[PDB]
Every structure is written in C-alpha cells, then in structure tokens.
Amino acid sequence: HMTIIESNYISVREEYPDIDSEVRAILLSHAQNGITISSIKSEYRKLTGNPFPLHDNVTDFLLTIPNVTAECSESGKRIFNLKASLKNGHLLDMVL
Amino acid sequence: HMTIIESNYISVREEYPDIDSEVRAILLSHAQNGITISSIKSEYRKLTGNPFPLHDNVTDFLLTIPNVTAECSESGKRIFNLKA
Question: Chain B interface, mutation test: which of A58, A68, A69, A73, most B Cβ atoms within 10 Å?
C-alpha cells in the first residue's frame, strides 16, 4: 500500500565517505547527555550542508557504526551516544 | 519487491501482556555480557513456550522498552542490556 525505498548502507558510505566520523564527532560532542535522531540530523546538515542521507531506520544504520550506543529513556525518547574504543593497545618505543 | 506487515506494538503488548517483563527478565540474567537478538528470541521460547512475536526490526521494539540499551560492538555484533 505505502511504499518505501530503503538505502544500501555500503552505497551510502561510498557516496558519503565521511559519514561515520561525521556521526562520531556529533555523538562525542554530546558525551555528557547523549543526542536524539532529530538533533543528529540537523547537526549533520550544519556540518556538511547536506541532509542526513538516511530517511528510514536511522537507529539500525547508527547501530552499524562500532561503539555507538542507544538507549530508551524513561519517557521513551531514544538517546544515542558513542563509547570509547578500548580494544587497541598502543605501544610506545622510547629512546634514551 | 518485498512487502511486510507493520507490527502494532500496542497489539503485541495486548496479545502478549507480559512481554516487557519477559524481555527485561532475559536482560536481567545476562547483565554481565549483554545478549544478542538471536539469543533473546531463543531464550524467550525457552521461558514462555512461544516464539518471539516480532520478526523484523526487533531493535526498534526492544528500544521502546524503558531502560533498554543497545550497542554496536567492534565486530558489528549488536548487544542489548539494561542501564546497570
């Protein structure tokens, strides 16, 4: 009845090569209290000049980016955030 | 192409009145590591005897339950839990 064209996530990330890091910057900047989808979108526009290229199932797309967390607030608002990546251990060779 | 029926979450919670309490229970017993959608479904079958009533976009439904968290792991695996 109603018809929707869904996005291929790889095509999105090829056409918009910076989208993951662009999202990470927006998330991390709101580390204290997190951020909703509407605010991710309008801030994406401010940083790129482009509309956020995902129109349906933004939650699923955002959760295809590693270390992205989402949570349902008590009021039912959906709050997104970025966790710190702890997996890589960094070696440092020191001289004299 | 591919047609589907959009699930009404009020209908679900009326046909399965204990579903929220059941998901939270499953999450409560997997607090230390979190749990994926596959394990939630098959754990739900174990506890209730019924198949999990939602089939597509379970993430969205799970995240309409207060206090439920979802994180994308480094592998891409999707982990669900409670804020605790």
Answer: A69
A71/B59 CB distance under 8 A: no
End-to-end, the C-alpha distance of chain B in Å comes to 42
Please answer whether residues B72 and B78 qualify as being in contact, where contact means their C-beta atoms are separated by less than 8 angstroms: yes
- Torsion over CA of B20, B23, B25 and B26, rounded to 10 degrees? 180
Please report, for chain B, the start and end positions of each structural domain, with discontinuous segments joined by +. Answer: 1-84
Task: Say what the resolution is, in angstroms.
Answer: 2.3
Q: What are the CA-CA distances from residue A69 to residues A6, A14, A81, B4, B44 (Å)?
A: 23, 23, 5, 28, 24
Look at B69 and A69 and tell me if their CB atoms are within 8 Å. yes
Q: Which CATH class is domain A1-96?
A: alpha beta
